[PDB]
Structures are given as C-alpha cells and as structure tokens.
C-alpha cells in the first residue's frame, strides 16, 4: 500500500495545475465582457433613475 500510494502521489500532483490554468483562462475571458455589460446597464439605470 505504501508503494501504491507513493505512485498515486505524482498522478494527483500533476493535476490541479492544468485545471487551475484552464479555470484562470476561462475567468480571464469571461470577466471583461460581463464587467462592461454590468457597467453599461448600471449607467443606464442611473441615467433613468
């Protein structure tokens, strides 16, 4: 079991980096568009109120 879990270690260690990189890329793509949309709708809300 020690050998098996020692082998299990690098496989899990290889993960959480590609996953986090993909998450960061998706968040970076998503953030500016909704940010500008929210800013525009908030400005319209203020100018209408």
């Amino acid at each position: 079991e020690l050998r098996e879990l020692e082998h299990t270690v690098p496989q899990q260690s290889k993960d959480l980096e590609t996953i986090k990189a993909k998450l960061k890329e998706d968040h970076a793509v998503l953030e500016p568009k909704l940010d500008d949309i929210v800013s525009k709708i908030s400005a319209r809300f203020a100018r209408l109120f």
Binding site: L5, V9, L16, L34
Partner: protein, 50 residues
C-alpha cells in the same frame, strides 16, 4: 442576464468550478494519504525493530 448573452459561458464556468472543487477534494485526499504514508514511515522502524 445570462440568457440575453449566450448562456454557454456560465455553464462552462460552472463545470470548471465543479472540477476545481472535486480536484481540491482529491488533493486533500492525497494529503491525507501522505499523512498515512507518514505513519507508515513512523511504523517502518518499528517493523525493522521487530
């Protein structure tokens, strides 16, 4: 708001955040397995002593 724009982005980000959650769960499981390896190292000297 998410139906005015394409709603695929929210679905993809939800999939990625769930992947992050389960990956973090597997990571803490790996840390617990490492702690079990630690106790194995703590008992290997006892096995050699036996």
């Amino acid at each position: 708001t998410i139906r005015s724009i394409d709603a695929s982005l929210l679905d993809v980000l939800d999939e990625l955040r769930e992947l992050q959650g389960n990956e973090q769960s597997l990571q803490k499981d790996l840390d617990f397995k490492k702690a079990k390896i630690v106790h194995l190292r703590q008992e290997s000297d006892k096995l050699r002593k036996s």
